[PDB]
Amino acid sequence: ANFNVAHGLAWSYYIGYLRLILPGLRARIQAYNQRHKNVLGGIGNHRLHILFPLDCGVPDDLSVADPNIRFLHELPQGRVYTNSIYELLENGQPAGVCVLEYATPLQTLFAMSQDGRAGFSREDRLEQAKLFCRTLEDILADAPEAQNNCRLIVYQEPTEGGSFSLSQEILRHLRQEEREV
Amino acid sequence: ANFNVAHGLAWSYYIGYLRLILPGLRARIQAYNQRHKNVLGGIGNHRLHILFPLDCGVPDDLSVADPNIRFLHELPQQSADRAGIKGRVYTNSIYELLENGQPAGVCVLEYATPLQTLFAMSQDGRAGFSREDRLEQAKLFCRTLEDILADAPEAQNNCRLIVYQEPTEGGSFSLSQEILRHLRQEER
Numbered sequence: 001a002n003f004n005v006a007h008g009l010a011w012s013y014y015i016g017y018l019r020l021i022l023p024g025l026r027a028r029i030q031a032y033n034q035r036h037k038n039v040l041g042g043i044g045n046h047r048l049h050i051l052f053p054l055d056c057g058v059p060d061d062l063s064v065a066d067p068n069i070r071f072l073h074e075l076p077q078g079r080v081y082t083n084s085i086y087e088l089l090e091n092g093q094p095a096g097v098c099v100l101e102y103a104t105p106l107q108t109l110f111a112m113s114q115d116g117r118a119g120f121s122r123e124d125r126l127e128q129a130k131l132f133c134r135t136l137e138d139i140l141a142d143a144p145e146a147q148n149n150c151r152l153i154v155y156q157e158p159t160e161g162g163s164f165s166l167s168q169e170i171l172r173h174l175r176q177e178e179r180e181v
Numbered sequence: 182a183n184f185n186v187a188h189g190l191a192w193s194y195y196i197g198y199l200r201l202i203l204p205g206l207r208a209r210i211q212a213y214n215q216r217h218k219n220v221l222g223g224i225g226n227h228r229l230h231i232l233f234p235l236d237c238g239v240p241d242d243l244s245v246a247d248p249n250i251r252f253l254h255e256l257p258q259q260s261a262d263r264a265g266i267k268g269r270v271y272t273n274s275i276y277e278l279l280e281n282g283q284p285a286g287v288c289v290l291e292y293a294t295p296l297q298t299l300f301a302m303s304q305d306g307r308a309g310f311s312r313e314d315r316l317e318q319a320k321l322f323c324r325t326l327e328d329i330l331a332d333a334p335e336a337q338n339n340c341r342l343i344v345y346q347e348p349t350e351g352g353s354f355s356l357s358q359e360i361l362r363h364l365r366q367e368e369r
């Protein structure tokens with residue numbers, strides 16, 4: 001079989017999702033900030049943060065296993081598209097809040113490498129993950145309204161487990177984006 | 182610039198949708214029937230019927246596509262935590278197929294999403310992806326997905342692929358008639 005899938009994953013993810021949700025994301029975050037102004041506190045960073053584990057290990061547990069990343073609130077809105085606001089903690093204390101999620105199509109790359117078909121090893125998976133990343137960034141580089149409204153967080157380590165701190169990785173990105181504004 | 186997307190679309194649709202939605206479909210249909218069979222009626226056909234128009238953009242709505250296709254009811258939603266989204270929602274719908282002014286069939290029915298992706302790609306204004314390219318990628322997407330499913334016995338027993346051309350110059354074609362022919366061949 002032909003396992004050159006990265007280009008299809010990138011265009012699927014852009015055309016079928018980022019192109020659809022990124023234009024209205026800032027307004028949904030501002031709507032949330034206004035609804036909950038006197039109560040819940042506000043989200044200053046209006047970008048979508050997309051976690052991109054190159055090992056394609058994408059959890060579905062809302063990061064319950066990582067106590068420094070905690071689901072805070074749904075970002076609300078036929079097909080339904082919703083997003084998630086997460087709290088980041090550092091030294092046990094709150095440290096950040098942002099709209100955050102994983103690049104779901106990495107789970108397709110994971111299943112292909114696990115599904116025990118031949119001709120698609122873990123190294124083949126990593127090469128497809130990188131090409132998926134590069135193609136997506138090339139697509140986003142020519143859609144400046146999309147590039148304005150999302151940031152990819154790419155990393156090599158297991159997303160959960162071991163000494164790598166995903167919360168610190170996300171926090172570092174938030175502070176970088178803070179410098180840009 | 183590299184618009185060879187069909188292979189990725191097929192694997193993504195299989196892993197990220199069919200493998201996720203098909204195992205729970207029968208229970209959702211059973212729940213629908215227990216709630217509705219005594220008034221609205223029940224659904225005897227428990228398979229997901231997926232439409233693959235090869236040579237025409239995916240209509241945004243089935244009743245628009247064919248006046249002989251009428252929305253009946255949604256199934257209970259499938260909700261699941263997914264890649265950081267809490268309770269991501271997957272919805273599926275039952276349609277009735279009309280013939281000569283009477284309902285003639287009822288089934289869970291939808292379009293294959295990647296064909297909509299391909300259509301949007303050809304309409305986005307970028308150079309190098311014409312209707313000709315779209316048609317070639319649509320056939321390859323269908324072929325690849327069928328190749329994958331021929332290795333997936335459980336899935337292929339729980340969905341049915343309805344693949345068809347459409348005429349563009351007034352040759353007779355009824356989408357409901359095409360679906361009905363498939364439904365009546367499944368009862369064998």
Ligand SMILES: Nc1nc(=O)c2ncn([C@@H]3O[C@@H]4COP(=O)(O)O[C@H]5[C@@H](O)[C@H](n6cnc7c(N)ncnc76)O[C@@H]5COP(=O)(O)O[C@@H]3[C@@H]4O)c2[nH]1
Binds near residue numbers: 012079193270272
């Ligand atoms: N009929 C149908 N109903 C659905 O709910 C659905 N969800 C996905 N799909 C299609 O199955 C395949 C796999 O989806 P995956 O989630 O792995 O990639 C998805 C996913 O990464 C992202 N995405 C789409 N919708 C959502 C969503 N509600 N929440 C988060 N991410 C989403 O954008 C990618 C492409 O989405 P679609 O372009 O709508 O087509 C998909 C795709 O062809 C669906 N098809």
